[PDB]
Amino acid sequence: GSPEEWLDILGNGLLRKKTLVPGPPGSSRPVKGQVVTVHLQTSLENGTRVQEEPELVFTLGDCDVIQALDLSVPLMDVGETAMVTADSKYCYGPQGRSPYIPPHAALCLEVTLKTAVD
């Protein structure tokens, strides 16, 4: 969508997504079960960048990435860059991710969806 629009993914207000850069007009959303490739950048609320993965490849919907990413990627077009704001429950939760992500950290995820293939 247009950048000022925020999507409430789950309907509880806790996982929200906006488009930063739209996919080209004819592009479409990926399907769960497809192998997707994304550029992921993860930051904390204070702006500290804690993850960057320029070529994160995974099967969408297989729970092989944090919920915040598995639940938001299906709502992006291939070629889109989105920003996702996610409550800690959808991220690394109580455990965190040593050493850079503490317990109960909300994350901001900038995600570019590059490819989605069967």
From Swiss-Prot:
N-terminal signal peptide: none
Main location: mitochondrion
Residues involved in Ca(2+) binding: 62, 64
Tissue expression notes: Widely expressed. Highest levels seen in the brain. Highly abundant in the retina.
GO BP term (any one): protein folding
One function term, GO molecular function aspect: protein folding chaperone
Domain PPIase FKBP-type: 33-117
Recorded GO CC terms: cytosol; endomembrane system; endoplasmic reticulum; endoplasmic reticulum membrane; membrane; mitochondrial envelope; mitochondrial membrane; mitochondrion
Top-rank taxon, per record: Eukaryota
Function description: Constitutively inactive PPiase, which becomes active when bound to calmodulin and calcium. Seems to act as a chaperone for BCL2, targets it to the mitochondria and modulates its phosphorylation state. The BCL2/FKBP8/calmodulin/calcium complex probably interferes with the binding of BCL2 to its targets. The active form of FKBP8 may therefore play a role in the regulation of apoptosis. Involved in the inhibition of viral infection by influenza A viruses (IAV).
Miscellaneous: Binds the immunosuppressant FK506 only in its calmodulin/calcium activated form.
Record's protein name: Peptidyl-prolyl cis-trans isomerase FKBP8
Source species of the chain: Homo sapiens (Human)
Residues of the full protein shown: 90 to 205 of 412
